[PDB]
Symmetry: C3
Subunit: 151 residues, 3 copies
């Protein structure tokens, strides 16, 4: 029942992350043990934070930020590079949870995937997007982790 949180934000990694605390709280509410979230710059540092977490063999890695189409948004690409495979239906459920209230939800490129025995979920970079996505994870995360482990 272990988790890691990574906040992808160059803006926040050098000087405020609001999404970390929200995710930490949700994980505690949901019974997960987790370290303080790693706040890292966009790009290669996301890939590195991911690799560190996977090497920790945690059950789930939740990222927030860097999933839009802005020049520096490379969280999904960094994530694709470390997973064994993707789960596009989960990423689409997370997008759709922002709909129809935030039409721009369809612009998130966030992916979900599995590296070994670790589920990885890209959440959006806003607190409202994060809550939306976590609401989706609440309905499935337990079953996913169990299905991942093989009942």
């Amino acid at each position: 029942r272990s988790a890691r949180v990574i906040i992808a934000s160059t803006r926040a990694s050098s000087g405020e992350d609001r999404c970390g605390p929200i995710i930490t709280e949700w994980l505690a509410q949901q019974g997960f043990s987790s370290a303080q979230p790693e706040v890292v710059a966009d790009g290669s540092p996301v890939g590195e934070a991911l690799r560190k977490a996977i090497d920790d063999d945690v059950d789930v890695i939740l990222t927030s930020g860097g999933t839009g189409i802005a020049p520096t948004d490379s969280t999904p690409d960094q994530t694709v590079a470390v997973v064994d495979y993707l789960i596009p239906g989960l990423a689409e459920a997370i997008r759709q949870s922002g709909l129809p209230k935030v039409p721009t939800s369809v612009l998130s490129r966030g992916v979900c995937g599995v590296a070994g025995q670790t589920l990885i979920v890209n959440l959006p970079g806003s607190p409202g997007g994060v809550r939306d996505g976590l609401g989706v994870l609440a309905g499935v995360l337990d079953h996913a982790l169990d299905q991942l482990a093989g009942k």
Copy 2:
């Protein structure tokens, strides 16, 4: 108007498949001619059963099983390896047909695609998922086959 059914289940291929009969029945109801379903183990045997079916030049191949995130679920990967291209909107429609009743529907990695003149559809591995997916195919399969053939 030809079809092939492949059941991807190591559990069923060595000792009960409930999904085969359902699919066979739906195909008969829908006017398709088809051979008895091939029940095969997860992994390479799915890829082989697929290649055999494509070489039979059937119009449609329906698979059931091995589309989740459990360690041995490699039907989508075996399918990606044999198709010329994918049809992600059809695979998403099939996932969404399980919603909102079975939230875990979003975990299916099943794909749809075309190999030459053969449409391939990954269905879920449960009988209820299969019925859900077949209900989606009922609204489009005829048109798809026709669009595939070029009116």
Copy 3:
């Protein structure tokens, strides 16, 4: 605020395109400047028309046609070959806009993506599909272009 329109149709490129005028009108209504739409044959000519447009450094390229599963429908493949990355949530929103009225909407393989500073959107090849898709673009296109440019 610049745009380019490409109509992918071998049928129309040799002898009537109804989708071009619709898109041109929508772009004018939405404040975009744009050249007369390029009508081109399926395949390599779509890729070429795309490259020409990207080299023009326009803000948005809208294509119509060649997104189904018929043998010659290669607009999405030509588009994947020129973009730096894809935006699958936008392409799914466009498919879903045809639903539930036109169940075959799920068969469109159209993609959306970014080449450098240029957003590219594959629309369907029918006038009703085009209107459906443009209705989706109306809710997000401005924000997308802005997010693309970095606020």
